Design a protein around this ligand. Structure first.
Ligand SMILES: N[C@@H](CC(=O)O)C(=O)O
Ligand SMILES: N[C@@H](CC(=O)O)C(=O)O
Lengths: 873, 873
């Protein structure tokens, strides 16, 4: 029963509607109401109201565009907040209810042939690391996280039956205030955000939600272990860590220079000082205890021995205040010797804090220890000094060029011409060399200098600020050895985890070969210290060969690497990229984590949280708890109860599925002559590049994000389904339909794969897709349009047939329902966006000036549409 | 049905009990449980358990005393918080429900012979000014306001039925944390607090409750005017103002020197900058509007004309940050020229803020205007630059000495010997003199210099920092003229309101004569600018002549002054002292404000909020709303519907009552030879002076507070009832009992007076009173003890008889019930305090050292007892 949800959306829409009424017009509200009516009509076949819609939109003046677009965008905004409130609300989906953890724990516990020590060890070895990434379509100048927390609080309070009418009146008064705020507090970036801006949004997510969320997650998790298993993890064990790529990822982004990284690195520390100060203030005042242990008194001895815990907190406050002061100078561009007690490592924070905990426990003040201090202890290890460690990522190709240029300058030869055996020879030689290689005062090209400067920032930064060096486009063993050489030349004192990123079908296919050669080099083996971390690029390989082939390729590569590393005694860590079924969030993700080759999470969960899903996965502290709890259950279950190995005939169905699907996908994307011209007309791809959407500067050249995003705006969702159904119907046509059904029933990998198409098919919309062709595509490309649309119609059948259902994502009614709601609310943004694109595109055709009203309205729909559709890849 | 209240106290006591169990013992919990059982028994007649109680207490070791006392004190603490939660809770007494205002407003509205314009004018002329005073028994080193706000929030959330069990578990987890905090976070001042400390507690009350409370009160009040009367007061009208005496009152307090006042004056400004900054941060970020009026754009014109409201807030932020910086230097003792934009006046804050409001309204952003800005606009006028204006107060006697010393130094004569006609002559002469009088570089005595220095601080401070100069002990017209002379010599540019404080029966009796002579002097008349403000000292006159005579004297004096000023065309402002029926809080206060001579609140409500009642009247923001709402209703009703004038025979019953009562009261307090010796034995009076309770340094010499407080600890409540009943029974005995009953039925002054004895009789406790005599008083004084106790037994009868009831404060069941609960919880503190006093008093007798454990336990009971008993005078 989704009645409460329906009530809330209606309510919020009434207050929003009121606000627009007050604000500036009843005219705009009529505009809005006419467009929905007319669009609903047109869809239901009325071809008279289709004309009326077309003339209605063409008659909108440029001064109506933005308000209309914002209007539609606001209603969608209210729907998602109603939707998200419902999810954590105990009388609704209840996402954050601690049973999520307990259900997993009970299942494990009463499973024969599962020793209790086996379960304990899996618990003690848990590890999660969530890597935040930028939001591709964040359209405003300042983060709205905190406002959202407030709107949700107001809804929580109104949920209480028995609320005295005066309280209700008060609550509604603030609610009205808050909605008016957003209608009138309009901010629209005029210029492309910068890596620092994006890095800043990530700090907003940390302070408005992760800061409270992680410790609550850790408290609940701990209560559940004791209740169900009979023990609590030790205080020193904090299995969660947050990392960011913001200001760390330079892959394809000129604007993320070594200077910016240096800066962002600095800012994080400034912000950790900001948040750590608030924690310590509280502690300085609340720890008025005077009873301490011999050991703790020793640690202060006299002076502050009459207010011991307060002493240690007072010291740290100063030490934090000192380093704060230092970093604001550095941020300003002022160089000045660093203070006596500058903070650089988490141990410097941990140490004293842990001292208090111990004496408080020892001395009978357990409940005080396990309160605010415990929360601070865990934030120390979860976020610490750097607040959020960053990851650096550059293409392999750029490292080759840096090293080629170097070698020709030195007269040694030209590294980018040598065979791969030669490069390894050269790299192992130099890696063992005690004489330097990088010329004292050199004059390389801009590019090369950037490569060199960035390793200098890495080297310069305090150990533990940078999590890893990711090599996008890794193809050979020399690609990994290359960055180790550069880091050595940059003077690095510690071992920095380097990770190849295989993100193509063939790279995926060669991945296990690439790593066994690497593991065979004794020098390499001893440098990683029994730990490797690979990165699987599902999203980019999917752009390469289609999702089915991509998926199967990934399945196979992880299975081979798990095995190879096991032989070799290396603790493998699979690093997951963006989207896919692992980035679905919620139940589907739990399913997806469990549907990976056995071994797969033995070395932890490390994932790239997609930018556009942060609100939906970590948007509020309770959603954070849900998300971390969901994942934690998946780790323990996947490690204690792995999926079965596929039957050999299944493997053969996958090979063939994979071939047919890749074959059909490339047929259109690469081989077909009309595609590109089609693609640039039917989707807003070109304009996604021009507008100020991401920090990167304004089919093989494109990147996954822009590929996926452009097709989602169009509503066809092309990238996430294309050859899958076609190959599946063909296998059905050989009478192997019952094997397909067994695979689905018995092989997690396969149901999960099939699951994922349904959701995509659930959000896709062929009426809208066709609407864009009619408004934006030239008549000669219409045939391709219908062709691709009919391909999809036929693919839902086969999938529905294999799944033995008639509705579409029938095992997930809440998600199905939530998709249904957003789909109606997103509807008119798509209807309006087609008019914008047409207005915008004819101005340029008529060699005219980019009207700011038309572009800003366009930017609103793009962000609206992206918000309603969430994950589509 | 007080079931929910009973549940909550039980719950909180269980968690507290748990906490002591964990903490350090089951032994202490046994100690606690034994004392209650044994004390309940002993009271119910069991004279075997009375022996057992006496031996039980004597056997407590000094290491058990404090924990036991704290224990009992904590339970009482939880009861008051349960009690206070209940009061504002909508499913309980509901103190803050806006109907309080509406009921008054409806009554007025449908009252014939009450023009709507008459009501509007009374509304537009409302005025309240609450003067905060120090808390006589604040025992800890840091304010606990904020913790209390939290405990109450936890209780609010648990009140919601339908709370998911996980939420309940979470809530209880914090609740446990918070209770443990207080059990273990023990602070006990070791040394007398200082005026700055006391001034600091007042800032805690302002930020934790008044800051939110005043604007909410103003919002509710405004919603109610529009709903019931059809109009809202204008934005510029903020009828409430908070003032403090902390660091302003030197009456009898050496430690409040001109230096300290200077300091406190400075600190307030520092704190207003602190709180005003938080308001402006919010505004700087939320006012992103770009549409402004001609006028507003003009005010910025270019530069910030692309972010206008944000401009003005950014300017003010800087200006605030500037003056903040300045004051922290001055606070430190550093003198340095003051910054360009130093803030000194509320207009400097008001101006810009009001500019935004106007354009926001003008431009269609009404809802944004009436939100956070409106809250800041009202705090500007309510608290402003100084945060809380202070009042200065010195005795008249000290001004005489300053001026005598001056005059003998100058060879002019000796002012403190001249008749009163001469002094006025001298004062009017000098007040009109253009030649100075105060010697350029003089050498007076310490005292005189203090008097001179303080007027210098007054003069030096920015206009609007000081509300008024109060003259305690004012007896003649020269007393008021004296301070005007001194202020003139101190160089003062504005007219400073001076107020005589009549606080004796004869001064009260002469008060109207004193003011008509003052008003007859043309010079004086033109200097006050049609405004005088008198201060009535009910509490001290009661110490002089007993409560009945005091009350009647006050009634008569206000009636005469109202009349005199009306003739003369002067807007009189009665300033109310401490306690009495006006300081009862809640319903009784509303009754009491209404039972004052007609005219009485025409010039506003100005009251001295008693220190020990702040938690109960302004402890939380919703209690603030209740308190201000209650008072506001009383003002409008008292001004539009005054009480009837007393029948002449009533006036004659009052005269006689007054005489008999004063006669019996002085018989004991002054005339009786055993009283003083009795008094110092039976009450903890001597120890209230020695211990570090107030900031003042360690029967006629005593002050009201210490008089009242000492008798409240003893439980006899002597000061608040003594001769009243005795005179009343005597008048009954002449057969005038039916006139007494008509007076009560028809004369508000009289029922109110009678009401007030009941409450006192309700909290008094003759079993305990007698217990202290038995443990602390020498056998020869026992007779006086019983005599005074039997006096009270007989006084309840007569009062009950006149009131036509059998229970005691039967018209107020909630207050009756709440008194009943606190009485049981206070019970054991009184039982323990007798043991402490005996232990403490024999140590000194045995010329021994003040054991710190015995004194600290004693300090806990004193504060406990004072907390449970609230207002007793
Ligand atoms: N995350 C959901 C879709 C959504 O909630 O937008 C899914 O993977 O099906
Ligand atoms: N203020 C109440 C007593 C109390 O609540 O303690 C009264 O004047 O009766």
């Amino acid at each position: 029963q989704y009645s409460a949800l329906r009530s809330n959306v209606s309510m919020l829409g009434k207050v929003l509607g009121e606000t627009i009424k007050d604000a500036l017009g009843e005219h705009i509200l009529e505009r809005v109401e006419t467009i929905r009516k007319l669009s609903k009509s047109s869809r239901a076949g009325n071809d008279a109201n289709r004309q009326e819609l077309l003339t209605t939109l063409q008659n909108l003046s440029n001064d109506e565009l933005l308000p209309v677009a914002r209007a539609f965008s606001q209603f969608l905004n209210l729907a998602n907040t109603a939707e998200q409130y419902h999810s954590i609300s105990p009388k609704g989906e209840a996402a954050s209810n601690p049973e999520v953890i307990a259900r997993t724990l009970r299942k494990l516990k009463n499973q024969p042939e599962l020793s209790e020590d086996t379960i304990k060890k899996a618990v003690e070895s848990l590890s999660l690391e969530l890597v935040l990434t930028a939001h591709p379509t964040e359209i405003t100048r300042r983060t709205l996280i905190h406002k959202m927390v407030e709107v949700n609080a107001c809804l929580k309070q109104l949920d209480n039956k028995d609320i005295a009418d005066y309280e209700h009146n008060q609550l509604m008064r603030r609610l009205r205030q808050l909605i008016a705020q957003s209608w009138h507090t309009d901010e629209i970036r005029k210029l492309r955000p910068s890596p620092v801006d994006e890095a800043k949004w990530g700090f907003a997510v940390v302070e408005n939600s992760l800061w409270q969320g992680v410790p609550n997650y850790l408290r609940e998790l701990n209560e559940q272990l004791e209740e169900n298993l009979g023990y609590k993890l030790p205080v020193e064990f904090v299995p969660v860590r947050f990392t960011s790529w913001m200001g760390g990822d330079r892959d394809g982004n000129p604007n993320v220079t070594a200077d910016i990284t240096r800066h962002v690195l600095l800012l994080s520390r400034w912000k950790a000082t900001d948040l750590f100060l608030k924690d310590i203030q509280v502690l300085v005042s609340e720890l008025s205890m005077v009873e301490a242990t011999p050991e703790l008194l020793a640690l202060v001895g006299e002076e502050g021995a009459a207010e011991p815990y307060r002493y240690l907190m007072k010291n740290l406050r100063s030490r934090l205040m000192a380093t704060q002061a230092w970093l604001e100078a550095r941020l300003k561009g002022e160089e000045l010797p660093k203070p006596e007690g500058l903070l650089t490592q988490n141990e410097e924070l941990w140490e004293p804090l842990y001292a208090c905990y111990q004496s408080l426990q020892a001395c009978g003040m357990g409940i005080i220890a396990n309160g605010d201090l415990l929360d601070t202890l865990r934030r120390v290890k979860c976020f610490g000094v750097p607040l959020v460690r960053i990851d650096i990522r550059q293409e392999s190709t750029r490292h080759t060029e840096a090293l080629g240029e170097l070698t020709r300058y030195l007269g040694i030869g030209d590294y980018e011409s040598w065979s791969e055996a030669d490069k390894q020879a050269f790299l192992i030689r130099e890696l063992n060399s005690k004489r330097p290689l990088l010329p004292r005062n050199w004059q390389p090209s801009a590019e090369t200098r950037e490569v060199l400067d960035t390793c200098q920032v890495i080297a310069e930064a305090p150990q533990g600020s940078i999590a890893a060096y990711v090599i996008s486009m890794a193809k050979t063993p020399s690609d990994v050895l290359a960055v180790h050489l550069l880091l050595k030349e940059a003077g690095i004192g510690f071992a920095m985890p380097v990770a190849p990123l295989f993100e193509t079908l063939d790279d995926l296919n060669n991945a296990n070969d690439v790593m066994t050669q690497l593991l065979n080099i004794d020098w390499y083996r001893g440098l990683i210290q029994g730990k490797q971390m690979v990165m699987i690029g599902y999203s980019d390989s999917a752009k390469d060969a289609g999702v089915m082939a991509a998926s199967w390729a990934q399945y196979q590569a992880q299975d081979a690497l798990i095995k190879t590393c096991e032989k070799a005694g290396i603790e493998l860590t699979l690093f997951h990229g963006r989207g896919g079924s692992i980035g679905r969030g919620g139940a589907p993700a739990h399913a997806a984590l469990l549907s990976q080759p056995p071994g797969s999470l033995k070395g932890g969960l490390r994932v790239t949280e997609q930018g556009e899903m942060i609100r939906f996965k970590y948007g509020l502290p309770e959603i954070t708890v849900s998300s971390l709890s969901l994942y934690t259950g998946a780790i323990l279950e996947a490690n204690l109860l792995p999926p079965p190995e596929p039957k050999e005939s299944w493997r053969r169905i996958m090979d063939e599925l994979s071939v047919i699907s890749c074959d059909v996908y490339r047929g259109y994307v690469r081989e077909n002559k009309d595609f590109v011209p089609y693609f640039r007309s039917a989707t807003p791809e070109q304009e996604l590049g021009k507008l100020p959407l991401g920090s990167r500067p304004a089919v093989e050249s494109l990147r996954a994000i822009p590929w996926i995003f452009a097709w989602t705006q169009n509503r066809l969702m092309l990238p996430a389904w294309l050859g899958a159904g076609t190959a599946l119907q063909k296998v059905v046509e050989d009478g192997k339909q019952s094997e397909l059904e067994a695979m689905c029933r018995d092989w997690p990998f396969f149901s999960t794969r099939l699951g994922m198409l349904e959701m995509v098919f659930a959000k896709a919309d062929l009426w809208l897709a066709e609407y864009y062709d009619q408004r934006l595509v030239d008549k000669a490309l219409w045939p391709l349009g219908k062709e691709l649309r009919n391909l999809q119609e036929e693919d839902i059948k086969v999938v529905l047939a294999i799944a033995n259902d008639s509705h579409l994502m029938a095992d997930l009614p809440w998600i199905a329902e939530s998709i249904q709601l957003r789909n109606i609310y997103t509807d008119p943004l798509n209807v309006l966006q087609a008019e914008l694109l047409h207005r915008s595109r004819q101005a340029e055709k008529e060699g005219q000036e980019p009207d700011p009203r038309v572009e800003q309205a366009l930017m609103v729909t793009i962000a609206g549409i992206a918000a309603g559709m969430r994950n589509t890849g």
